[PDB]
Amino acid sequence: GAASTNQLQYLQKVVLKDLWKHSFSWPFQRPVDAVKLQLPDYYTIIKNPMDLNTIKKRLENKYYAKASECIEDFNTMFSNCYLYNKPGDDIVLMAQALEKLFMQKLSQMPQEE
Numbered sequence: 001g002a003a004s005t006n007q008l009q010y011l012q013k014v015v016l017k018d019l020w021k022h023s024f025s026w027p028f029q030r031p032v033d034a035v036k037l038q039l040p041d042y043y044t045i046i047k048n049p050m051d052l053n054t055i056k057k058r059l060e061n062k063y064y065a066k067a068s069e070c071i072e073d074f075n076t077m078f079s080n081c082y083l084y085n086k087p088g089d090d091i092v093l094m095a096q097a098l099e100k101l102f103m104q105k106l107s108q109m110p111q112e113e
């Protein structure tokens, strides 16, 4: 069947790779194991966990019909961090740096019609 939209191809081939390679990506690479990571009440507060590997697998397996739902998963990743943690926390600065890069790469995505 038809390949994914040109925007989803960009998200997979350009955006995901660039965020993964950023030096601050390591907290965001894999699903949060809150017990192992000593994060109390994480699953009570964060009802929709999301991470880069999950997004990667979704892109590789045609989970998304269009780019907006993939963009929303990247945004849930960042928002989960902002909600659970506190202003001034180093992890928040890390998420903010990845999010700034994300916005930069989205601005270079091909335009829809």
Ligand SMILES: C=CCOC(=O)C1=C(C)Nc2c(c(=O)[nH]c(=O)n2CC)[C@@H]1c1ccc(C)cc1
Pocket (backbone or CB within 6 Å): 026, 027, 028, 032, 036, 037, 038, 039, 080, 081, 084, 085, 090, 091
């Ligand atoms: C025993 C665990 C050691 O801490 C880590 O390895 C962490 C991981 C993987 N992830 C999260 C942590 C957190 O405090 N809050 C979160 O939301 N996450 C999930 C994204 C902590 C952490 C990350 C980075 C900094 C600078 C500080 C703390």
